[PDB]
């Protein structure tokens, strides 16, 4: 059985924790729930750690007193189809392979599934670790509770004796790097310096050997990613988000200075010796928009190249861990600001951005966001009980599963079928424009080889490549983003029409140029 | 927000509690979750209580760390028909009235329903308090959570100015007495001596005015009736059971000495 | 009413049947149930047939005493979508037309439906008989019991007065030949010599006029295809399978000599005069893997060409009726062994194989097969009854319809939803790789005209054609095979990655060569 420790003795050296712990709703929760500090206490001074105390990162550390939240979190939504490749006619991006050619996502890009699986899915996807990590067998794919208990309880490593990124299966890539893991786990929260900069006190950084790093991580979406363990109050821990909101002064709501001030973030830094080491962002309110934006954003988490001169931007560069914190119409400027692109298209040679799940930046300015609605209202609502103590569902999933709580309490004028119909009207319309955007991108792409081989000038090919950047951005934002336009239907529509416009412009340019050479 | 107190200070006088609390699965659970003892600590001696500490008897004292169990407990099974009289042809005892004539159950004996309602059902049944206590209105019958929060949040008393058992409605009885409450609540667990014997330290006993006692009681089937709050270990608190099993030496399984 | 005949008199001339009949569980079943031999008995000697006795091939001959098996067999699964073309974006092979161009399957290749329809579907598919045979009207498509009663009860022939294969509708082919029918019916079991070789006693052979042959056949999947009518014991009758397992010594489990010996097959031959005529394969055990492998295999049942010199291999050749009895990684060697390919691709000119539903050869070596699980365990399980006599379901269908019996009795750790989720994880993953494999095959294919027209050398085009053979094989195995990877997920994954690898290699070869001509 756990035996409580003398927290007051801890506090003689830990005033920062004291001030958080003694004031919040965990004031009575003894350190022994999350820390084994016995040898630490025997060997430390206020200026010397001595033995490193153990800190529990497992979600069960919280489940003991908060089983309902834990259980709701770990639930697997079987209706969220697993390992479903997006580059197929029946998924999100029927022409993705053509359009994304030259990028690692061509190796595999599945639809998201339940949060329990995020770390294991990151480990086993064909694009990440060259097929090194796999589920122990094909039965383990169901095991959300097992994944939560730990990745390495359900996975195997093809070669425990080497730590290099390489291909074990032919059609894989090795895109994973340490920045990725920050959106899969925070098991490394005490072993990773802010932004993954090099640091004397950090075991892990942006430049670590990712296979070695992987082996030290176990749990997905730690409960403390949104909740300070000491104060119990709302926070974020993700460095990239704190960097955008606070360091760069952009605010929690870049488009609304007032809401940014009312629903802000306070950066708190923790030192190792005399040096700043790690940081968290305490939230003014329990604002799920910002909590969820720890991961559901467009980001850099990868090397790339400079727009200016094409040179490599490696993981050692701060730009390899970056939240753009920009909506679709501000993104190109944001990328120019850091002089960065992701890949060169394999067919067109255009420098292109790679977009990822920009839900947070898409939701900005939408009718719901402007009305003070937040991600949790639709995706993790309060439970409604005929008799019971209310709690917040932590099963982050489509509102289709809980429409009464997620939509209909607000939209009293609608039945469930009407509400679903409204969602589907937007998604259907948006998807049509995604498909049309891809048709026109593909049409442009296919003209590049013809143009090149016809002797069209580099000047003209470069003009077309500049069009490709925009045509790509204004399309891929929406295949990346998970709501199929629902989060911001007017923005999706404007963007996709812009993509098509740009592709059409490039198609005409290239066709005319080819025809001129003939011729 | 709760602020923890120094349990070591309590333990100086509360050796029994120390022995239970430090060893079990509530060793990390601070006293402040269930007791407000500041004035008590200021005034008690090793042998005299001083000012009496406040002890939480509400089930929500446990629900903050054990929501799943609490929520499961307070669920109302609507399919368990409410206020369904047993002395009817379609229930358990078609000829009950003839057979039980002379007994107070003739006034009303309904089938049991969900545990959330036990205390309020005890208070309002026609055989218990002469109809003195009633739901505030007929809507309140649904409100399991409400009953759990406290009987007096959903009930009324026909005459707060008197404490005698009497009939307020013609076809009622006044069978209730203090012993009944021991199987409805243990809110009185610190105010009732073992078996309900007269005791200088007990506010309530078998011979108390049951209407006065009732008004002091709020919560059904306290979580601590089966779980020691200090050790978290399994227990019973009901005096009559302890008397049978232990005092009279009959054992937990009187037919099986081994078990 | 049936009147029993004196079987002992039959046995004075039929010792082979005597030895089977008197020993098995049909010892009490009188010959009159399946044979009308009255005039035969009047005219025969032990050395002269006399009048040919009539043998019933209809399934109702068995339904009289085995109604539960019959009724379960004839059930139509309406949820198995009918006449659903595979070459569509929402089915198995979105780019099939491009990839299969030059083969008859381009005319139509639907998904399989319930067994009741196998003979009628064979007759009416657009690729088979030039549209000659059709359902009498579009209502008859539902009529599984009617199909079982007889094909010609539900179909019409556009020209009863001619027997040549020709096109009656413009976009049809005439690929059907007599070998096909062996996987649709065994009504011809007494009229077809082993392998369909020419034989004095055979009315029908590989070289028969298939339209004439068709008109003489009526019933699908005769009950006796798996059960000897005389002994009632387990068997196969399909010549091609007996040829692979026994004649060629490959065994019932080519990859497991021990299991092959425990679960083997004994070839039994029947003579006409002094000459061997037909054969069956008595099974050591009621092994559904081998029973089902009568049809659910990759095969030749068609003319083709020699890999060595391109010459025609006609129906008269033994190779036109062939079970390769080889897994995907052994197939190319197997085809080289008989010096055979199916068609030349219409665009690339590559010699290619045509693969068909290799379930048996795919299932080999899989985790389930290695654990002694067999097709019937998932697709025709025992019925579970609260009160009753157990029997084996003969409704061969997806386990999704009977998950309790097909999966969950073995997988006690799973709910139905979990089991389905595990199936879907594999199928989703496999399908993604099929789609990617097609993308890369299509990309290669499309370069052939460009390369040819640019003046790329035949040497280079031939190198690419050799790559095409492999890229095709390692893809088409999986669109042909019906489990979408479930029967052997690791093999599917390795194969499909190999396809993609080969296509990529060819794409690079061709692009570089085209670019060199320009450059
Ligand atoms: C005698 C002073 C002292 C005492 C008492 C003390 N600590 Fe520490 N603790 C330290 C110092 C110094 C460090 C390292 C700070 C630094 O990195 O500069 C540290 C670090 C830690 C860390 C972070 C370790 C990491 O992974 O980086 C934890 C967690 C911690 N202490 C918990 C506790 C607990 C719980 C107690 C009471 C049970 C306690 N400490 C008591 C001095 C103390
Ligand atoms: C020993 C039991 C215990 C442990 C372990 C525990 N909590 Fe708590 N938690 C509490 C209690 C008690 C409260 C306050 C309940 C109340 O009064 O509303 C609380 C409150 C909270 C709240 C509400 C805070 C607010 O300001 O509204 C959050 C969020 C929370 N805990 C998260 C966690 C997380 C995350 C963990 C794991 C790192 C954790 N808890 C572990 C007991 C615990
Ligand atoms: C800023 C947070 C963030 C970073 C950094 C991040 N991801 Fe993700 N990842 C997500 C989110 C959110 C999802 C779910 C939404 C989606 O897939 O569109 C996701 C989903 C996934 C999935 C499941 C779906 C799929 O694409 O197959 C995999 C695998 C994955 N990420 C791998 C990676 C890899 C490899 C890296 C580093 C190259 C990475 N992630 C970095 C946020 C992140
Ligand atoms: C992605 C951010 C996020 C994660 C991770 C997270 N929560 Fe929460 N949690 C929330 C939100 C949002 C609320 C509701 C805040 C509000 O509306 O007041 C909440 C509320 C809570 C509460 C307060 C009581 C309630 O249910 O409203 C507790 C306790 C809690 N969470 C525990 C946990 C546990 C335990 C975990 C890990 C299994 C967890 N949380 C993980 C976002 C998060
Ligand atoms: C006003 C309600 C609403 C808000 C607020 C909301 N979403 Fe959504 N979200 C939806 C709907 C509707 C869908 C489409 C779900 C579907 O069709 O099943 C969706 C889809 C998603 C999906 C894909 C879910 C799936 O299974 O397909 C993700 C991930 C997502 N939202 C994240 C977020 C994020 C992160 C936020 C806050 C930045 C957010 N959402 C805010 C309504 C909302
Ligand atoms: C401040 C949080 C907190 C409060 C309040 C609380 N408990 Fe617990 N309880 C715990 C923790 C922590 C454990 C140990 C969990 C574990 O290790 O399995 C526990 C364990 C238990 C157990 C399991 C004991 C065993 O030996 O298996 C029971 C029963 C229990 N509590 C009942 C209660 C009751 C009844 C109440 C209200 C009188 C209560 N708890 C109040 C935190 C709390
Ligand atoms: C048009 C409004 C309306 C209608 C329809 C309605 N109620 Fe009521 N009901 C009321 C109001 C107002 C009260 C008194 C509320 C109060 O004063 O506390 C009430 C009281 C009650 C009570 C308590 C009666 C008592 O004597 O204390 C019950 C039981 C009840 N309603 C049930 C129902 C049922 C069941 C239905 C449907 C058959 C129904 N009501 C329809 C408005 C309505
Ligand atoms: C030994 C514990 C015990 C005692 C003491 C006790 N009860 Fe009960 N009571 C129960 C149990 C158990 C039930 C549920 C089972 C049932 O009703 O058969 C119940 C049910 C009830 C009910 C609901 C069903 C009904 O009969 O209408 C009422 C009212 C009630 N009791 C009243 C009383 C009264 C008045 C007294 C004192 C005269 C009393 N109880 C004493 C255990 C007890
Ligand atoms: C006159 C009734 C009758 C007819 C007609 C009949 N059977 Fe049987 N069959 C039996 C009987 C009797 C058994 C033995 C039942 C038992 O004792 O288990 C049997 C057993 C079987 C068995 C089980 C054999 C074993 O060894 O386990 C199979 C398979 C079978 N029959 C197939 C067929 C087939 C196929 C046909 C049609 C060609 C057919 N039967 C026609 C009566 C019949
Ligand atoms: C008012 C009567 C009637 C209605 C209503 C009706 N049918 Fe028919 N249907 C017929 C008749 C009469 C035929 C031709 C029967 C024949 O000549 O054998 C026919 C033929 C058909 C055919 C065969 C068509 C062909 O071209 O061979 C199909 C399929 C069919 N019906 C389906 C349906 C469906 C499905 C519905 C409902 C959407 C429908 N029918 C409603 C009377 C009707
Ligand atoms: C070795 C056995 C075998 C041979 C020989 C065979 N088939 Fe099949 N056939 C099957 C199996 C098994 C299926 C069901 C699985 C599938 O369609 O993938 C099938 C399905 C079919 C179907 C229904 C699905 C579709 O493709 O539209 C048709 C039509 C068909 N075959 C026609 C033919 C033709 C024409 C021939 C000769 C050219 C032929 N079959 C030869 C085994 C065979
Ligand atoms: C594709 C091969 C196949 C076909 C064709 C077939 N069966 Fe079976 N049959 C089986 C299998 C497999 C079993 C179960 C053997 C075992 O597990 O012992 C079986 C079992 C039987 C039995 C034994 C009792 C039972 O149900 O287990 C009978 C009788 C039978 N089948 C009758 C028939 C009838 C009648 C037909 C035609 C409607 C038929 N079979 C067609 C494979 C076949
Ligand atoms: C361990 C169970 C299992 C075994 C054994 C098994 N299958 Fe399957 N089979 C499946 C599953 C699962 C599917 C996919 C069904 C679905 O998704 O609905 C499938 C699909 C099929 C399909 C397509 C069914 C459909 O409607 O899509 C056919 C045909 C098939 N199997 C034949 C066979 C053959 C022949 C064997 C033996 C050589 C075999 N199976 C052995 C599980 C099994
Ligand atoms: C007759 C027993 C049995 C049947 C029926 C059965 N399984 Fe299995 N299955 C097994 C065994 C044994 C394993 C291997 C277990 C191990 O070694 O860990 C297995 C493995 C699996 C695997 C892992 C395969 C891999 O390659 O890693 C999956 C997925 C699976 N089963 C799903 C199913 C499905 C779905 C069904 C129903 C269609 C099914 N099983 C029916 C016994 C069975
Ligand atoms: O690949 N996760 O953005
Ligand atoms: O076309 N049946 O393999
Ligand atoms: Ca999903
Ligand atoms: Ca990006
Ligand atoms: Ca009841
Ligand atoms: Ca089918
Ligand atoms: Ca073939
Ligand atoms: Na094209």
Curated annotation (Swiss-Prot), chain B:
Domain of life: Bacteria
Binding site for heme 5: 115
Subcellular location: Periplasm
Residues involved in heme 2 binding: 31, 34-35, 230
Binding site for heme 1: 10, 13-14, 40
Binding site for heme 6: 180, 183-184
Binding site for heme 4: 223, 226-227
Residues where heme 3 binds: 26, 62, 65-66
Post-translational modification as stated in the protein's UniProt record: Besides, it may lower the pKa of the Tyr hydroxyl group.
Assembly and binders: Homohexamer. Dimer of trimers.
Role of this protein: Catalyzes the reduction of nitrite to ammonia, consuming six electrons in the process. Has very low activity toward hydroxylamine. Has even lower activity toward sulfite. Sulfite reductase activity is maximal at neutral pH.
Family: Belongs to the cytochrome c-552 family.
Protein name: Cytochrome c-552
Portion of the parent chain present: 33 to 291 of 553
């Amino acid at each position: 059985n756990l035996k409580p420790v003398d927290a007051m003795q801890c506090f003689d050296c830990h005033t920062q924790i004291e001030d958080m712990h003694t004031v919040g709703k965990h004031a009575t929760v003894n350190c022994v729930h999350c820390h084994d500090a016995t040898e630490h206490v025997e060997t430390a001074s206020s200026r010397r750690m001595g033995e490193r105390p153990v800190t529990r990162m497992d979600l069960e550390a919280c489940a003991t007193c908060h089983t309902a939240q834990f259980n709701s979190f770990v639930e697997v939504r079987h209706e969220s189809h697993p390992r479903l490749e997006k580059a197929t006619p029946t998924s999100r991006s029927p022409m993705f392979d053509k359009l994304i050619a030259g990028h690692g996502f061509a190796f595999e890009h599945a639809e998201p599934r339940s949060h329990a699986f995020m770390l294991v899915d990151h480990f086993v996807v064909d694009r990440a670790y060259g097929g090194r990590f796999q589920f122990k067998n094909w039965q383990k794919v169901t095991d959300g509770m097992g994944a939560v208990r730990g990745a390495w309880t359900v996975l195997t490593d093809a070669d425990p004796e080497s730590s290099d990124q390489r291909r074990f299966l032919s059609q894989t890539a090795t895109a994973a790097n340490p920045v990725c893991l920050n959106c899969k786990t925070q098991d490394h929260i005490l072993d990773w310096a802010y932004m993954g900069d090099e640091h004397e006190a950090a075991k892990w950084s942006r430049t670590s050997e990712v296979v070695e790093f992987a082996r030290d991580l176990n749990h997905p979406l730690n409960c403390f990613m949104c909740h300070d363990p000491h104060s119990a109050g709302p926070r974020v821990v993700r460095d990239g988000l704190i960097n955008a909101v606070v360091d760069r002064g952009l605010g929690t709501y870049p488009h609304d200075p007032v809401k940014s001030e009312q629903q802000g973030m306070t950066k708190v830094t923790f030192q190792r010796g005399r040096e700043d080491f790690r940081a968290i962002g305490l939230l003014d309110t329990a604002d799920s928009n910002v909590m969820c934006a720890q991961c559901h954003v467009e980001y850099n988490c990868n090397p790339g190249y400079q727009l200016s001169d094409g040179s490599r931007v490696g993981m050692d560069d701060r730009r390899a861990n970056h939240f753009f914190w920009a909506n679709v119409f501000d993104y190109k400027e944001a990328a120019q600001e850091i002089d960065f692109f992701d890949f060169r298209h394999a067919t067109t040679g255009a420098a292109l951005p790679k977009l990822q799940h920009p839900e947070a930046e898409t939701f900005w300015g939408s009718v719901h966001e402007r009305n003070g609605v937040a991600c949790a209202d639709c995706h993790m609502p309060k439970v409604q009980l005929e008799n019971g103590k209310v709690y917040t569902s932590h099963s982050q999933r489509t509102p289709r599963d809980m429409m009464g709580q997620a939509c209909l309490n607000c939209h009293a004028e609608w039945t469930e079928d009407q509400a679903l119909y409204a969602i589907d009207y937007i998604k259907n319309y948006t998807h049509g424009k995604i498909v049309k955007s891809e048709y026109w991108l593909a049409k442009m792409i296919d003209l590049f080889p013809v143009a090149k081989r016809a002797g069209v000038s580099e000047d003209v090919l470069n003009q077309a490549r500049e069009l490709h950047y925009d045509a790509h951005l204004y399309w891929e934002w929406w295949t990346a983003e998970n709501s199929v336009g629902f989060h911001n239907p007017d923005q999706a529509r404007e963007s996709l029409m812009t993509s098509i416009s740009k592709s059409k412009e490039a198609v005409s340019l290239l066709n005319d140029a080819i025809d001129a050479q003939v011729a």
